[PDB]
Structures are given as C-alpha cells and as structure tokens.
C-alpha cells in the first residue's frame, strides 16, 4: 500500500526549469516497479513523460528527451522530475504514479502553471441574497473569489459541513487573473441562524481567508 506525495512549487516562469518531487511511503522504490511522471493538460489530455525503474533505470517520452530528467533518492525514498526550458505549453497537472501491473497507485496530482504573470492573492466577497426578497423554504447564498493567480483555490463552506447542495463553478481566466464563485443552498432554520462562512485557501500566497455571510442593510 504505497503513498505518492508529490510536492514542488506550482508557478514557474517560461524558459526556467520545473522540478518536482514525489514522496513514496509504504514501499521501497528500489524494491520494485517503475515510477513515473505523467502530465495531464487542461482539456484532460494525458502525456506520459518518463520514469526511473527500481534499479535506477530511466526511460523518457522522446518528445521531451532533450529537457527531461528523472532521478531518485534511496535514503529519503523519493524521485524527482526536472524539466528544463519550460514554455506556457508545459502548463499541466502533474501526476506521479507507479508502473507494472498497470498503474495501481497514483499521487493526488499537482497543478503547475508556466507564466510570467504575478502571484496575486484573491479578494473574497460574500454574496448574500437580494435586498428585500425574504425567502421561505429555500435560501441560496454565495461567495465570489476575485483577482488571484495562479490556478489553485479551494472554497469550502464552513468546513465540509454544508457539503451537500453546494456548487462551486470552475474558474475563468481574464487578463492573467481568475474570478470564481460558489453557491450554497440551505433550508432556513440554518441561516441566518448558523454561522455559514466561506472558507477559501489559495496556497501560492498562504491566504486561507474566511468570510461570513451576513444579511444586507
């Protein structure tokens, strides 16, 4: 029962080099298997990139050949992706996985963005219901996330609790910045009763801000 824990910074400037780390636990990378790097482009295309076997033996996808470099560390039990001369076109979600017997274990993925655009922290805004229109049975609340980069936020309501009846719309890019919002649907004996907050994390600036949905004035 292996675990893939892929670390590495998610924002790389063009021409520079992208270098990631998978961290294997509950299995020895020298023992067995082939340990790989797979990228998935937006639009869900999958490219196999390469690997290093249990015996330190590498194989790459030749469409990378020149710039790809996959190595490992026995002691710590980790392998490393290095990819030089990145372009915008190398912006994908990076997965490490194990090979042989198929692809049993996978990492959780890591989004990598190749851009000269600056990291902006996101401004969160509560979107309480319209003015006078008191509700009845149903009530719909929202949260809007503006002016952030790069791709990677996580809007949670309270903290998972409001799990059900939640829609978080995928982000849309305008001028190097993402705006995204999320709606939560509730009964009423729930709100304004229960402290319903919007919990957004944006890792690239460590900005786990919460905002509390209050009625307007």
């Amino acid at each position: 029962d292996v675990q893939l824990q892929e670390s590495g910074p998610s924002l790389v400037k063009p021409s520079q080099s992208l270098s990631l780390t998978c961290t294997v636990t509950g299995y020895s990378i020298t023992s067995d298997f082939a340990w790989n790097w797979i990228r998935q482009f937006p639009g869900n295309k999958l490219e196999w990139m390469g690997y290093i076997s249990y015996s330190g033996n590498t194989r790459y996808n030749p469409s990378l050949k020149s710039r790809i470099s996959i190595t490992r560390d026995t002691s710590s039990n980790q392998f490393f992706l290095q990819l030089n001369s990145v372009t915008p076109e190398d912006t994908a979600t990076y997965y490490c996985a194990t090979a042989g017997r198929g692809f049993p274990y996978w990492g959780q993925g890591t989004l990598v963005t190749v851009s000269a655009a600056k990291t902006t922290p996101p401004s969160v805004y509560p979107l309480a219901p319209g003015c006078g229109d008191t509700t009845g049975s149903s009530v719909t609340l929202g949260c809007l996330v503006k002016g952030y980069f790069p791709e990677s936020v996580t809007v949670t309501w309270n903290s998972g609790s409001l799990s059900s009846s939640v829609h978080t719309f995928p982000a849309l890019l305008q001028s190097d910045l993402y705006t995204m919002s999320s709606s939560v649907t509730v009964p009423s004996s729930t709100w304004p009763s229960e402290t319903v907050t919007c919990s957004v994390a944006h890792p690239a600036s460590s900005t786990t801000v919460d905002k509390k949905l209050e009625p307007r004035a």
């Binding site: 869900n44 295309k45 999958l46 490219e47 196999w48 194989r59 790459y60 996808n61 030749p62 469409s63 997965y95 996985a97 090979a99 017997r101 198929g102 692809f103 049993p104 996978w106 990492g107 959780q108 993925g109 401004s123 805004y125 509560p126 979107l127 309480a128 219901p129 319209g130 003015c131 006078g132 149903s138 719909t140 929202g142 809007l144 503006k146 059900s164 829609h167 978080t168 719309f169 995928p170 982000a171 849309l172 305008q174 705006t179 995204m180 919002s181 709606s183 649907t185 307007r216 004035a217």
Partner: protein, 213 residues
Amino acid sequence: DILMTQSPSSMSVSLGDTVSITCHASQDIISNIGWLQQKPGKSFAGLIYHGTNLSDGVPSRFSGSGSGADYSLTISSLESEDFADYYCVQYAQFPWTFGGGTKLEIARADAAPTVSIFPPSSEQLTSGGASVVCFLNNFYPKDINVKWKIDGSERQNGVLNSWTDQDSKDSTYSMSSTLTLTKDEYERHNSYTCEATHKTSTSPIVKSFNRNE
C-alpha cells in the same frame, strides 16, 4: 508512438445501465493495457490491468476484455460514482501513450433552473469594483442562455459565464453568470435583470433588483 483510439468520446446512459468502452491500439500491444478512472477534479485510480485483471478494492461491476489491437471496458449496474472519466493506457511499447478519454453522463429529464441574482457586496464596492452575479442551478440539458440588462438596455460587456460539469448526485448542471462593473457605473444605475432562457421554459426566468433598495 502507438495511437490509443478511444471510443466513444462521450455518452449518456441511465442508472443501473451498462456501458462498453472500446479502446483501439494502432498496432498489437499484447494485453499491456490499463484502465483508469478519474473522478471529477481528483486523481486516478486504476481499474483493470494487463487487459482483464481487476485491481484490488475494485467492484465486480467492472471488468475488461481484449486481444491484439482491441480492448474494452464494461461497467454493469452503473451507479452515480461511476459517472466520471475513463482512460485506457498502453504499456507495451515506448513511449507509453494514453487514450483520449471517455466522459460518462447520466441521462436526466429536462429541468428549469433555479435562478438567483446577487447585488455587489458592500465590500467589493468600497474596494472600487462591483460584480452583479447570477446563479442558475439544477437544470438539464446543459445548453442555457443567460442575458443581462441595465434599466432595460441589454448588456454583453463585462459578463463572464461558468458552467459546472454534471452533478452525479442529481444529474444536473449549474452556471454562474457574472457581470463586473466599476463601482461608479454601478452607482449610476437603478435596475439589474438576469434572464435565463432554457428549452424547458417558453418564457425566460427573470430575476432582477433595484440598486436603489
């Protein structure tokens, strides 16, 4: 590099149904093939390997078969969780290459959306900007058309639409239509109207407010 011809590119079966997805190798990979599932925004979990073998923890609703250049995946008694993406992968000849994927969708009946409009928060305003937001939830089919107005005059500038993929919980979609203005221009207008037109309804759903309020 061997081309993994995956078919069909998408579907829409009902619950408890059964799907067969057939992946076609450009050559003859001797059963070196894997069947992956990607649940929405998550990672992958291998389903079949070496062509016909179930991976551990994998339900007996799943099962694959194939020989030579031609392999397939069937899922019996389909369930909500099963309505995700699927990809075949070949690991016989280098470089290993993946299929183009297969999206899977639950055929639902039509739904009229549940529309809510949201004035700008008095936190965005004090900040300079002002977005008038609009959610259209729980409807089918995906095709929707939302339109904005400002004191009657329709407005195409400053809008930004976002659809979610299908919710497996209820086989519906949702979309958020965002209008973004400058706090000054917002303050120079009274009415804000959001119009959803769906194949469901003959006349559009109108939610609007008065900034005056």
